[PDB]
Amino acid sequence: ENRAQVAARQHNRKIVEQYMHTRGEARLKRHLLFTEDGVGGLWTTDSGQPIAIRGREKLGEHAVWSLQCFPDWVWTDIQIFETQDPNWFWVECRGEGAIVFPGYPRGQYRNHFLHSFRFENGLIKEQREFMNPCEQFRSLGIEVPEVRRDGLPS
């Protein structure tokens, strides 16, 4: 069983690496790193509900959109964490690029990210990204509310 666990972890790490380094036109094929029922998406949004893209086909369709609205996106400062689960990885990184979001002025978006990758049978079953949406608000020209700190110590 330890052999099976070890085997899984090394292959899955390569897939996380490939995902995090997928750039440009290659993003159109990134969904091939998922299971047929794989899910990806953004877990931290203004509404408090995740935005999940469900299914390898819908993920492939969505990459076409992502290529237009984040045309030069790169992940940077990539740190991949294996865990005691050979099928679960976490990634700490930054990301940056132009943001061309429908209905908003073209801007530049930079943020810190955490990604969760869960695997099934050698491919990604669930990818989740977590960030501070306040930085995406700023990139879109949306006013960020400020918590009053006057009464706080520091």
Add this chain to the structure above:
Amino acid sequence: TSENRAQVAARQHNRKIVEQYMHTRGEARLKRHLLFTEDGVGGLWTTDSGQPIAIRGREKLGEHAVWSLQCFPDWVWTDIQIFETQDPNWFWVECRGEGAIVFPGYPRGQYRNHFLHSFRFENGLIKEQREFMNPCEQFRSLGIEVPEVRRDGLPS
């Protein structure tokens, strides 16, 4: 090997400290800073301003606990999942948290959120703790209006 045994031992001990931290609640929070190195850092990495709020030093962490017990009087971490990593001195935690929020100048509220924690260790104690959440949920708990990204132009 002897080096592998030392890494296993460090990871097992550090996991116990992460567990203790995550289950520390009530008055015990006043002593949670003893789980840190003398120069340890803790705090909140995701805020409205985009800059972390870092509390630097075991002494300052203990002093800050006094404020934390006033403004989050009954905080609980729930749904705790602890992740060891290939670094015996680096752990991640996925969890939820809940409690009253009693922030100066705001109405008393109830705050619920999802959290990720990072714990880095030195010599058996916490050198750096960092907390990551979506601040929009804390805005809601304080009665602060959350801006809405318009979705009309997006694929549905």
